[PDB]
Every structure is written in C-alpha cells, then in structure tokens.
Design a binder for this molecule. Structure first.
Ligand SMILES: CC(C)(COP(=O)(O)OP(=O)(O)OC[C@H]1O[C@@H](n2cnc3c(N)ncnc32)[C@H](O)[C@@H]1OP(=O)(O)O)[C@@H](O)C(=O)NCCC(=O)NCCS
Ligand SMILES: CC(C)(COP(=O)(O)OP(=O)(O)OC[C@H]1O[C@@H](n2cnc3c(N)ncnc32)[C@H](O)[C@@H]1OP(=O)(O)O)[C@@H](O)C(=O)NCCC(=O)NCCS
Lengths: 307, 311
C-alpha cells in the first residue's frame, strides 16, 4: 500500500541543510532548553537547519493553506502571516522545538517578526473546567476555549487592529485573570499546544477549528514508554523548582518523598495525559506536514515529511 | 457567526460569477451526449456550475503540483507525477454519474490536455454470489457490499505508479460484476472516483476504525446533494425509464419489471427505494455530506441552485 510520508534518518535529513548558515551561538541555544530537555548545537544544525530551509522555501513560494481560495475569489492585499503549528504529547519537548524554530526563523533569510503563541493560554479557567467537571481532563480538546483560539488566529491573520491573547500560569495552574497581552501582527506565527491538529474529522459535526488556518504543522513524536519516564523525570525536577514555591498550586508535591513523587507522577500520566495521548493526540500524528521522532536521548533520529 | 461554520455558501449567480474567463471546451451536442437517464444537463449548467468548478479544481491541481516542485528542489531529486484524485459521492439517482462525466470532459481539455480516468466504484462491488453468502443483497450499495481492500489497493497502485493495474467492471444488465470483465487502467493525470462509498472513513462506525479507506487517497471530494423527497421521485421516474429501456432486454436481471403495469412499477420502485436505497441514504450517505470539499445541491429541475465550499 502507498504511504503519504517520506522517511529520512538523521544523516539523510541533516544532509538537506545545504548551505543555510547558522544564526545562533551555543550560549543562545542552551538558554532555549526546556526542563529535562536537551538541545545541542548538532541538533540545531542537523535537524532544525534543514527544517528552516524547507520551511523557508514554502514561505517564499506563497503556498499557503488558504492561497487557492483567495485566488479563486480574490487575492486582495495578502501580506498574510505564515502560520506554523507545533503539536505532540505533554513532556515530548514541543516547547523547545517552538523556541528554537522561532529563533532561527527570526534571523535566517532576513529578519522576520515571528510570534510564538502557546495554546494553553486558551484553556478554560479552572473555574469553568470545575463547573463542567472537566479537570481530570486538562489538556483534552474540550478543556480549551477554541471559539476564542480560532477567533484569535483569524483576527491576527486577517490583520485586525488590537488583538490580545490570554496567558497561562503554571504556578497557579490556571490562566491569569487579567493577564491578556496584545499581539502585534507578525510575519510568522508559531502556534504550540496539544490541540493544534484537531479537526472535525477525527471527531465534530462541523464547527471550525484552528488547524484550518495553519499552513505547516509539525508533530513532535516519541514512543509511549519514553514519554512516560520523561513525564515522571520532568515532574521530579518540578519538585526541585517550580513546586518549591509556596504559592505553587502543587506546592504539596514538593514535600513528597522521591518515591511518592514517582508514584504521584505515574498516576497523573496514566490517568490523564496518557488518555489524551491515545485518544486525541496519536490519531492526529499522521496528519502533520512533518513528524519529528526522538529517541531516549531526546534527539530526533527520524524525520517523516508528508509528500 | 460566519467566521466559523466550515462551509462557504453561494447561490447560482454567486457561484457562476466565479467562472471568470475559463472558456468552454464543449459543444451543445457533446454535452447532450453526457446526460444520464432522467437527468437534464444544459449548456448553462455547464457554464454556470461546472466551469467555475473547473477553475477552482484547476487552482488546486497546480498548487498541489507547485508543492511537489519545492519539495523536489528541497530533496534534490525528481520524477514526481502523482495523479490528482477527485471523488464524487451522493445518493443513488442523484445524478452523480452525469457530474463525473462532464467534469471528466472539461478537465480533459481545459488548461491543457490531461488524461483523466473515470472509475466507478460499483465495479468493486462483491459479486451477487458473495453478497448472497453473506446475506447482503438487500444491501447492494451499502459500504459492506463493496470489496474495498481491493478498491484501496487499486487506487494506491494507480497513484503510486504500479505497472499493470486493472479494475473490475460492473454490468447493470446482469445486475452484477462481469466475471472476466477486468480492464487495464493506465496511470492518468487525474482520476475521478465515483461511487456511493467514496467518502467512507474511520469516523463511520468507530470499531477498529484502524483500517484504511479509499477516501484517504482522495485530494478533493464532491458530494451531489438533493432532498429526500426529490430523490425518491427521481428514483421512481428513472425506474420507469428503465422499464422502457434496459429492462426490455430479455437477458436483463430485471426483465420481469418490464412487464409490470405502470402502477405496479411505481409500487415496486417505491419499496425498492424505501427499503434499500433510502436506508443507505440516511445511514451511510447523508452522514458523509458535511465532510466533502464541495457540495452541489440540486432542485426539482435537476439543476444546482446552491453550492457549499469547505473553507
Ligand atoms: C497545562 C498543561 C496542559 C500544559 O501541557 P502541554 O501543552 O502539553 O505542554 P507541555 O506539557 O509540553 O509543557 C510545556 C511547558 O510547561 C512546563 N510545564 C508543564 N506542566 C507544568 C507544571 N505543572 N508546572 C510547571 N511547569 C510545567 C514545561 O516545563 C514546559 O516548558 P519548558 O520549555 O520551560 O520546559 C499540563 O501541564 C497540565 O496541566 N496537564 C494535565 C495533568 C497534569 O499533568 N497536571 C499537572 C500536574 S503537576
Ligand atoms: C448498482 C447500484 C448500486 C448503483 O448505484 P450508484 O452508485 O448509486 O449509482 P446510480 O444509482 O447513480 O446509477 C449510476 C448509473 O447506473 C444506471 N443504473 C442504476 N441502476 C440501474 C439499473 N438497475 N439498471 C440499469 N441502469 C442502472 C443509471 O442510469 C446511471 O447511469 P447514467 O449516467 O447512464 O444514467 C444500484 O443500481 C443498485 O443496485 N441498488 C440497490 C437496490 C436497487 O435499486 N436495485 C436495482 C433495482 S432495479
């Protein structure tokens, strides 16, 4: 049977960097690393530079997801921002991928704005999730306010005046009451979150989805077993940092012994994030324009490009 | 809110206005020859409905093609040429066969000459024998009465450029697939796939929806639409014409229907619609409607008075 994806291993993908030079120092790179997430200069050069290239070809060739329709009715004024999305399991390290992609796309061919918006800011406040009995489902599609997320991207893309975005706080495990921040129309918009690939055709009737505004979608992938230990390990680091803040919504986790923490982390993964993984995330994997698969060392050892 | 309903709605004048300057490459005589039984196709229908569609469809194809090129540059390799796949779905008697026929004529000479193969999904039905053994032929046309492992393998082979691909052929005279009727299919530039089950997918009944459907190979899908009441009378009327033509053949699987009085025929046609095709309609077809890239809604005169494009 024919498959829609082209597969490359590290050497093959890396070989596609051609001559894009790199615009980042090791120091700058290290600052982009996420908790329990390693990012080397070789990872940037071998994985992200070839991606920068491709991504750049697509942008300069005004080949967007809404290009055909525009020409079919009316191309107007354009100047339309390029929209890239980044999806994948919690703890997969999609936040680091977004950060470096944004740094590179910012100075690669020429200076571009490049805004990085995270989808979590668009979650329904803990209050609402409470009223809908949805917070054993934080991160699930229904725990997000997408009428707003879609309205946001539409406004940004379409050049609407004063657009603002809600902001999420991991310290209080909820969106900041009056934290909305203005977002200036950028040249490129990177959208990172769990629900960025949702479509009315994985599950639903119509409704409209944020994925319908995306031009290129990246899915950061890793086997279930690796994601489990990554989640647990990352949890243990939170115990040493974020959780030590007395105002932390999970401050009590700072007090758990190391073995209780591991226990608590597993049930949190198994009973919530894993469900989300299997139910709403994995299914979207084969819909991405690009898939990056990481190994035990957090490095991408395989790339799949949808032809 | 219009910002978020997935479909863009146009009426005849609005859609028609989108034809721009695509010229037409068909004479009235050529068009008339494309009409199906009990199906009217005018030159205005072609110009107002199918030309704008030819345009859009064409934009998609070259875009889709331009893409293969950037990637080609990026990879540093060449030799693409993946056929463009269009599908056509809709109720039995909705006139989806006519739509396929004209779309294929137009796409064949519009921007430039393209091959354009038109395959009908019925050829892939399980022979009457198999349907018999599974007690499935009060369900001819239902998803399960089709051999899709084969339909999918076919499209995959065609798209992927496999050597000698062949397709099974269906015969309405014998109400079954032709025992040794398989015909070779040369890889085309465009493949139009028309049949009842072309939009089926995992969403349709989620129980090991971990299967592959032909709809996963389609690039653009068109759904020919018409209200239930219109489809019923269109089915009955069409049946009455079969009575005057196809059924008059002594070898027709339904020859006995030629002998029915006009009132018995109407009665026979209704129960055939109500007990079989209507079920299929409600159960497996209607549900797929809102998944199509485009929806063409026809009125009592068989003309498309409304078009819905999925943004
Ligand atoms: C809010 C939430 C949905 C975010 O999910 P996400 O979009 O998949 O993104 P990620 O899981 O990749 O995490 C993204 C960033 O937030 C951080 N993060 C995630 N959860 C965190 C937490 N509870 N406390 C502090 N930081 C957290 C990561 O460190 C990462 O940033 P980095 O780049 O600085 O490392 C997830 O934290 C949440 O609530 N999940 C539901 C159950 C659960 O695990 N709850 C928290 C239990 S302590
Ligand atoms: C085989 C069958 C599944 C085809 O269904 P389909 O894919 O929906 O396509 P359509 O109903 O739109 O018909 C397609 C073409 O076949 C013709 N056709 C359909 N049924 C026919 C029949 N019984 N005899 C002769 N021609 C028939 C139409 O005239 C049309 O071609 P046209 O463009 O020349 O008009 C349908 O004929 C069948 O068997 N349905 C089950 C119950 C039923 O009605 N059976 C036949 C009762 S007489």
């Amino acid at each position: 049977l024919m498959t829609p994806y082209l597969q490359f291993d590290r050497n093959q993908w890396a070989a596609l960097r051609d001559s894009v030079p790199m615009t980042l120092s090791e120091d700058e790179i290290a600052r982009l690393k996420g908790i329990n997430e390693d990012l080397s200069l070789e990872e940037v050069a071998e994985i992200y530079l070839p991606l920068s290239r491709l991504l750049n070809f697509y942008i300069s060739s005004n080949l967007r997801r809404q290009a055909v329709l525009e020409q079919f009715l009316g191309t107007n004024g354009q100047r339309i921002p390029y929209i890239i999305s980044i999806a994948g399991s919690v703890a997969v390290g999609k936040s680091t991928t977004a950060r470096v992609l944004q740094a590179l796309l910012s100075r690669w061919p020429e200076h571009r704005r490049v805004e990085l918006i995270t989808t979590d800011g668009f979650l329904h406040p803990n209050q609402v999730l409470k009223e809908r009995g949805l917070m054993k489902k934080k991160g699930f599609p229904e725990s997000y306010d997408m009428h707003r997320l879609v309205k946001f991207v539409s406004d940004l893309k379409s050049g609407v005046p004063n657009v603002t975005a809600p902001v999420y706080s991991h310290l209080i495990y909820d969106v900041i009451p009056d934290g909305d921040k203005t977002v200036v129309q950028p040249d490129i918009l990177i959208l990172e979150g769990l629900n960025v690939l949702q479509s009315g055709m994985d599950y639903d009737p119509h409704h409209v989805f944020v994925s319908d505004f995306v031009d290129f979608s990246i899915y950061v992938d890793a086997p279930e077993d690796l994601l489990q230990t990554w989640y647990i390990n990352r949890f243990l680091k939170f115990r040493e940092g974020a959780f030590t803040d007395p105002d932390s919504y999970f401050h009590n986790y700072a007090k758990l012994t190391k073995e209780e923490a591991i226990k608590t982390a597993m049930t949190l993964w198994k009973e919530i994030n894993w469900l989300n993984l299997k139910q709403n995330i994995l299914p979207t994997r084969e819909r991405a324009s690009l898939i990056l698969t990481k190994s035990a060392n957090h490095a991408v050892e395989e790339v799949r490009l949808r032809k």
